[PDB]
């Protein structure tokens, strides 16, 4: 019915990457038990709160479909409690620092002894065996490590961070592939495995297209689809010309097409006061006649200076600036509608306000209103994969330690034994 019905997940994860993974597993039916430290819990509970003493949207948008237990794991009685939980678990997920889980006496070797079928899944900054294996890494450092910062932004500006979570959430989704892959192994062998994703590596996987460019750049000396390939277009902050004559590593291309065909971010009406009043407009090679029709340049259809990719290289940025002139009195939706008539790939820059209140995204289950009778309802992002015979049922994030007694009951413990654990301050 739901993909991960009956999968028990022992969840040690905190902050963004790990919780993203286990929340999505939760959305697909997994039984997720969140192990948190006493008093404070996941640090996201108290970061960027919109209301004092209420769990922040940081926490609640990453921790739906979970239960929370409190546990001091650096105590003898906390360690025997884990062992019982590990024996019930199908998957153990963690994103502590590199040596953290081993130094608690729960090495992969010992975990295998406790439960032969359990999968250990971890997110790290860098892969095991890497020179930076032992480093603690945060979102933007991870983007810098994996090639994304170097290849994002403008030639005359700094390396630029992406607003998308290429380090954290991306690494969590990659780990989900790892976990589900290990579940498929287990069907054959009957044994669990260890799966690990480095944030640097998850970033690199998405920057594969720029490793393509690096090799083209080495082999040929030029990237013809880049703005710097147009003579006399790009300059540094001191007015020096930028060209591929002197470029040996993949440059920042502004709003160039990347893995798509050539494109640019073009202003629409009201761009001076509206930060998101833009479209992205693509010049696909086989759509040049249609573009010529749209912008009333019939003379450009038969001109070899304009009618091939190769002819347009010395003037592509001039072509985009001319096209942009046609959008000066039209908003982004009107431009997108106009382009659609011609079959030209083109779409608006959607603001976060526009996305948060879009009826379509709520219709399809991608933006979801979570019912939270304790904190008030909030929006979250649902499952991005849609299935023919399954619908996620998203439910609110747990309060700290809300299910501690509930899970101890399930472990076999009776009332008196729980009373002792509370008294010893282990839970």
Catalytic residues: 168
- 3-state secondary structure at position 185: helix
- 296 is a contact residue toward Mg ion (CB under 5 A): yes
Q: Which residues pair with 370 in a beta bridge?
A: 378
For Cl ion, the binding residues in 256-275 under the rule CB under 5 A are 260-261
Contacts of the segment 137-140: beta carbons below 8 A, 24+ positions apart: 137/167, 137/199, 137/200, 138/167, 139/16, 139/165, 139/166, 139/167, 139/168, 140/167
DSSP state at residue 195: E
Backbone angles phi, psi at 345, to 5 degrees: -60, 120
Rounded Cα–Cα distance for residues 157 and 60 (Å): 36
Q: Is 225 in the site for Cl ion (CB under 5 A)?
A: no
Q: Are 392 and 413 in contact (CB under 8 A)?
A: no
Judged by CB under 5 A, the number of residues near Mg ion is 4
DSSP string, 201-266: HHHHHHTHHHHHHHHHHHHHS--TTSGGGSTTT-B-TT--B--GGG--SPPP-TT--TTSSSEEEE
289, with CB counted inside 10 A (0-12, 13-18, 19+), is middle
| Minimum CB–partner distance for residue 345 and Cl ion (Å) | 6
The two tokens of residue 136 are: 């603690």
Q: Is 74 in the site for ligand COA (CB under 6 A)?
A: yes
Question: Regarding beta strands 263-267 and 278-282, do their DSSP bridges make them parallel or antiparallel, or are they unpaired?
Answer: antiparallel
The answer to the question of residue 71 lying near a copy of itself (CB under 8 A) is no
DSSP, res 130: S
Q: Is 384 among the residues that bind Mg ion (CB under 5 A)?
A: no
Residue 99, annotated ligand binder? no
Residue 96, marked binder:
yes
What does R_g of the chain's alpha carbons equal in angstroms?
A: 26
Task: Considering the complex, state which of residue 62 and residue 300 has its C-beta at the smaller distance from a copy of itself.
Answer: 62
11 binds ligand COA (CB under 6 A): no
Residue 110 interacts with, from Mg ion, ligand COA, a copy of itself, none (CB under 5-8 Å by kind): none
**C-alpha dihedral over 175, 207, 151, 355, to 10 degrees?**
-60
**Residue 169 binds to Cl ion (criterion: CB under 5 A):** yes
Instruction: State how far the alpha carbon of 87 is from the alpha carbons of 38, 117, 301, 411, in Å.
Output: 23, 9, 70, 10
> Which partner, a copy of itself, ligand COA, Cl ion, none, binds residue 3 by CB below 5 to 8 Å per kind?
a copy of itself
Among 39, 105, 221, 260, binds ligand COA (CB under 6 A): 260
Q: Between 294 and 333, how does the x/- string for binding to ligand COA read (CB under 6 A)? A: ----------------------------------------
**103 contributes a contact to ligand COA by CB under 6 A:** yes
- For residues 195-254, which are near Mg ion according to CB under 5 A? 221, 244
User: By C-beta, is 65 or 145 nearer to a copy of itself?
Assistant: 145
Is 306 marked as binding a ligand? no
423 within 8 A of 94, measured Cβ to Cβ:
no
Binding of residue 262 to ligand COA (CB under 6 A): no
Q: Which residue number, 74 or 191, has a Cβ lying nearer to ligand COA?
A: 74
For Mg ion, the closer of residues 296 and 415 by Cβ is 296
Q: Is 77 labelled a binding residue?
A: no
Q: Which residues bind ligand COA (CB under 6 A)?
A: 14-18, 35, 37, 43, 71-74, 95-97, 100, 103-104, 123-125, 136-139, 167-168, 259-261, 286
Q: Which residues bind Mg ion (CB under 5 A)?
A: 221, 244, 293, 296
Q: Which residues bind Cl ion (CB under 5 A)?
A: 15-17, 138, 165, 168-169, 260-261, 282
The binding site for substrate comprises 259-261
């Amino acid at each position: 019915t739901k993909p991960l019905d009956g999968i028990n997940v022992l969840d040690f994860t905190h902050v963004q990457a790990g919780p993203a993974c286990t929340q999505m597993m939760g959305f697909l039916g997994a039984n997720v038990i969140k192990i948190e430290r006493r008093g404070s819990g996941d640090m996201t509970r108290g970061w960027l709160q919109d209301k004092p003493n209420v769990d922040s949207l940081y926490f609640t948008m990453f921790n739906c479909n979970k239960r929370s237990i409190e546990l001091d794991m650096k105590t003898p009685e906390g360690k025997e409690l884990l062992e019982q939980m590990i024996k019930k678990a199908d998957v153990m997920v963690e994103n502590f620092g590199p040596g953290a889980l081993d130094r608690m006496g729960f090495t992969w070797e010992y975990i295998q002894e406790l439960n032969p079928r359990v999968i250990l899944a971890s997110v790290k900054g860098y892969a095991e065996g890497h020179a930076n294996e032992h480093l603690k890494v945060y979102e933007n450092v991870a983007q810098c490590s994996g090639g994304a910062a170097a290849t994002t932004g403008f030639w005359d500006g700094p390396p630029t961070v992406s607003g998308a979570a290429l380090g954290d959430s991306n690494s969590g989704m990659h780990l989900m592939i790892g976990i589900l892959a290990a579940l498929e192994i287990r069907h054959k062998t009957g044994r669990g495995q260890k799966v690990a994703v480095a944030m640097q590596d998850a970033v690199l996987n998405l920057v594969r297209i720029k490793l393509r460019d690096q090799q083209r750049l080495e082999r040929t000396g030029i990237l013809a689809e880049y703005p710097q390939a147009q003579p006399n277009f790009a300059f540094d902050r001191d007015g020096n010309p930028l060209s591929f004559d002197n470029i040996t590593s993949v440059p920042r291309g502004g709003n160039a097409g990347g893995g798509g065909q050539p494109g640019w971010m073009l202003k629409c009406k009201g761009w001076e006061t509206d930060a998101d009043s833009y479209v992205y407009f693509t010049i696909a090679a086989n759509m040049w006649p249609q573009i010529c029709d749209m912008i009333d340049k019939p003379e450009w259809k038969d001109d070899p200076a304009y009618n091939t990719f190769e002819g347009r290289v010395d003037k592509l940025m001039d072509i985009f600036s001319f096209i942009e002139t046609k959008f000066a009195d039209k908003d982004k939706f009107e431009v997108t509608e106009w382009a659609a008539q011609y079959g030209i790939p083109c779409g608006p820059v959607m603001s976060m306000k526009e996305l948060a209140h879009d009826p379509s995204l709520q219709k399809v289950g991608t933006v979801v209103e979570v019912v939270d009778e304790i904190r008030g309802n909030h929006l979250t992002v649902g499952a991005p994969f849609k299935f023919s015979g399954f619908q996620p049922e998203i439910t609110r994030a747990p309060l700290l330690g809300e299910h501690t007694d509930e899970v101890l009951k399930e472990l076999g413990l009776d009332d008196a034994k729980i009373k002792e654990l509370h008294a010893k301050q282990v839970v």
